[PDB]
Write a protein that binds this ligand. Structure first.
Ligand SMILES: C[C@@H]1O[C@H](O)[C@@H](O)[C@H](O)[C@@H]1O
Ligand SMILES: C[C@@H]1O[C@H](O)[C@@H](O)[C@H](O)[C@@H]1O
Ligand SMILES: C[C@@H]1O[C@H](O)[C@@H](O)[C@H](O)[C@@H]1O
Ligand SMILES: C[C@@H]1O[C@H](O)[C@@H](O)[C@H](O)[C@@H]1O
Lengths: 327, 325, 325, 327
């Protein structure tokens, strides 16, 4: 494997949230999203017809995988993880199985995952994928319809507005037709995938969890899978803020905490609550000392840019880090 | 022209800055614009080739002149003034004379000035136009090339990067071919224009100032022109805040400002004047017989920023509350 | 006790956090408190010797109970609830039982609770008290030493730095000697208390919960007590926002919140809820028959922060506007 | 002199604004000061009776000249300049001539200038003084009463509210009785003064300008005086933002631009518009390349602390600077 050895010593990674949600940028008809701008479709129950039409305005002229990967490399990040497809159900790659994707639906007409995969290969960074394997707001039988007992960063976990008939929904339809095929797609194209990032099942069955584990193993034998997929089908445990030293057995000794620079994963115009360089550097050092990789999220803006203050704070966090390691 | 009487009593107006600059939103290649985001092309000397290409990404799905004018009406604004064409040289209307415009250059493929003109006619709001009659960064002979002695919200007043040869530039070429024709266009289409908003000439000759005055008078006899055009060719003086006490023959005055510190949308500028600040300034200007022209900088999807809307509406509630007492 | 009828229809109340924590204002030796600035002594384990010395610098020249209650009245708040004594153990009234209080320890040399109680009586506002009946960081046997299993807005629930010997601490000593006497003090002086606001017991026994209930009932028979004290010793349930839909026999409910993210004043916390957010939340809570208890964290000079005042007043104007429609 | 040689190569200095204005912290009776919080007494025409009473609440428990000078030293600042007395007329040293001072008027009962002077001597930093030699809002005949033709960061340049009789004011009374004696005081006590920082005369006569120049020369022969005092009585020209490369002859080749981290010189609770580390570092490098010392102001808070974000941004600016000089 020795992908295991590399992950123990990686320490630092860039995460990217980017999708149709990025264009709305935390705002819908003069009202604010929750802290999570990427959840805006659920928050305002925006009809798929309307939300999907955002694709017609997706033309990020300043997107540049080379420049993004370079920034990651300059901050000493050793891997990059991207949203291939979030809860909204929109793919950021050229999906054969669903035309609801950046390549087919947008004037941009380009494979974002492909460009990042290539930028990473040439730069010598490992490449990881995020995929929402349970929630899909574009799919009539998207997940979450049997677990609205608990509150969300939107309204409901499922698209309950376009598809209200909760007692006639069947996730198997969504899983077989979109979910598994799309996982096969991202895991076969775009070369070696170092890390695989799934959500916690609400809907997805035990069988269906095992299936995704097998699929990834067969197509990407070196790919490290994160705890979220399901118990006993992972190679590193993803820890939440509430789980970090001042429980899920991890047999390989591999741990990763994800966070954002501000309070949103997706870009949000109103969210300027950027963690200071010192906060970023200190948290990284704290996580690293406990043998935990820091996966730090950038939410790209409508033109596909790292926000100015996100870049500034990553670079100043790097200078504080280097200064401290010289002492 | 009872337009004079109406302006004395108007008290409040919406101004709109919107253009290609709105898409960059105060940011270029990881660096910040000045307080003035609309000046970003000059600030970073962005080649016309590149800046112009922003047009290919201009698709403001949420633009809605009816909803914008409704907001203006609800805040008790009696007129609306829009950027037809700013220093960058990009027209926000269907220009016959230049294809560098929202209708021809953008997937949106719609006349912004036309939609606002109509929304205003139906809502019963007077309609005013802003036009950069001197500065044009898209025109080889754009203005400002004989007055870089003074600092700007960008680098230079003219496009000195695409068109460096300052000693072979001739503003007459730009004026005759783009400026005057475009003024004729905006003043003839889009119905009655109540207010005309020009910049202070740096380059534009005395003759050329008189020409624009005549053109507006002949096409829009009721249209009130602002002091900026040149001395003795105006009907109201536009005041800066630093010029109100404690040279206008009609007794008509107007101070323009923005809610934050930028005229164009700027995602880094969240320094919104509070409702109380907005309401108090309006009351101060009105008591001195000065119309408050308050700018909204629409975002890439053609939306009034959430906090701009909130603060206009809360300023209105403070104002109404105070008039009930 | 028509106090029940009055609380069902009260709808809106001011809450006040104020203490030694207010002087540090979210900051200690170049580092930030948590969202809760009032928790700063626990957050940085500041020795009582040092923290207590803040009392020597407590001289809020601009404190004015009349002006504070007037603001509350102008926003249509019908009651006011104050911190008599928070987790830090410092009394904001002239306590016979402990000299660790605003009157005895500070150059200000005045009873804050007394001035507010009087300002409220004269203004026609009901007066409520908050008291930390379990946690006391100044008391060797302060509460929380048997429940550090769970994380806090500081470090530990108890003062574990000045008083580390957890296995030789006895809350009974603190309860008998400081807690019950101080409750007797605040409930006997300062006239009628409409609302009594306690914390959730971590340490405090079943007996000790019943005792406080009895004490309040005997001294203040009209006083409505909140659920936090313990099950079956309350007259209204204090709800968290996450517990309102889409266990109270009198039908009385109250949700408390702050304008920014801190209860105590925090100079770094400028995340003020907009007027619209405040007005809408109030309307939402009121429609569900829930009183909105909205916290102000007074600053070192005893002032309502400028933006807290602005946003309460603008929230009031939005509310009045909406009721006129 | 070779104080001249040292100033050419100093590059960086800390400035401190601190006074009664610091306690109000940009706010008076629910209304905001201008960008300049230190100007608040003029802005709201606060009677001397009331403003002066702030002295009774001045007890900055966390003031620590050693820690302040240490921070300055860690950022590579080579000198420290303090407000001995600002426009409000309140001395921050033990003045024999006026009891309106930190030592006599406040429960703190300590000489701030003295503690900083000592902290600097022991740390090996040069020590400089600011003094408002024209404006004094506490003095009946304070300056500015013949130049209200122009707007200010308050209302008027002079105290025109406590002392309205403009046509019966005489600056000579103020100059002879308070100004010159206080300059003699600060220049004789607190040891060697490296830099002397005066305001531009509005009121102060040509004679009176020459007098202050002579006084400083006789008491502090090595002390470099800044252009503001008056034409031909200075050793370095202080440049404003509008005067810095993309005029006052400077014969020694010595230049200094002062600025603050946020938009206020005095502490202001509402002013969180902190210049980012990159902005601070870049400006410093720009000024230094043009042979201009950067004098960067900290506005101490009511407890005598460097604001958390001021400290963080100075330290991160230092790390960016060191990183860039390694390359
Ligand atoms: C990283 C975060 O994990 C959560 O489960 C998601 O709901 C958020 O949108 C985000 O992707
Ligand atoms: C309203 C403002 O007037 C100024 O002169 C212009 O330069 C700005 O860009 C803006 O249009
Ligand atoms: C109102 C809030 O209730 C909580 O329980 C307390 O811990 C906070 O400090 C604050 O008093
Ligand atoms: C450094 C600044 O210089 C100006 O002249 C003063 O008016 C300000 O208060 C501040 O001291």
């Amino acid at each position: 494997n020795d992908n295991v050895a590399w992950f123990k010593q990686a320490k630092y990674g860039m995460m990217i949230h980017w999708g149709l949600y990025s264009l709305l940028a935390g705002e819908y008809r003069g009202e604010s999203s929750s802290a999570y701008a990427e959840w805006i479709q659920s928050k305002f129950q925006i009809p798929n017809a309307e939300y999907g039409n955002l694709a017609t305005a997706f033309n990020p002229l300043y997107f540049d995988a080379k420049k993004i990967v370079a920034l990651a490399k300059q901050c000493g990040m050793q891997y990059l993880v991207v949203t291939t497809k979030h809860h909204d159900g929109f793919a950021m790659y050229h999906s054969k199985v669903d035309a609801y994707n950046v390549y087919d639906a947008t004037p941009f007409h380009r494979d974002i995952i492909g460009e990042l995969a290539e930028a990473c290969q040439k730069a010598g960074l490992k490449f990881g994928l995020y995929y929402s394997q349970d929630l899909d707001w574009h799919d009539p039988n998207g997940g979450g319809y049997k677990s609205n007992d608990v509150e969300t960063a939107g309204t409901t976990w499922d698209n309950s507005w376009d598809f209200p008939d909760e007692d006639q929904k069947n996730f198997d339809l969504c899983f077989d037709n979109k979910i598994l095929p799309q996982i096969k797609e991202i895991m076969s194209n775009y070369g070696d995938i170092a890390t695989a990032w799934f959500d916690v099942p609400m809907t997805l069955s035990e069988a269906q969890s095992q299936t995704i584990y097998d699929t990834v193993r067969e197509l990407q034998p070196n790919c490290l899978i994160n705890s979220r997929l399901g118990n006993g089908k992972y190679d590193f445990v993803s820890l939440g803020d509430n789980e970090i030293p001042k429980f899920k057995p991890s047999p390989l000794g591999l741990y990763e905490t994800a966070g954002t620079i501000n309070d949103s994963w997706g870009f949000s115009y109103h969210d300027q609550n950027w963690k200071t360089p010192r906060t970023l550097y200190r948290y990284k050092q704290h996580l690293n000392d406990f043998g935990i990789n820091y996966l730090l999220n950038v939410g790209l803006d409508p033109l596909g840019r790292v926000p100015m203050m996100a870049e500034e704070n990553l670079l100043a966090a790097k200078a504080l880090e280097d200064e401290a390691n010289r002492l």
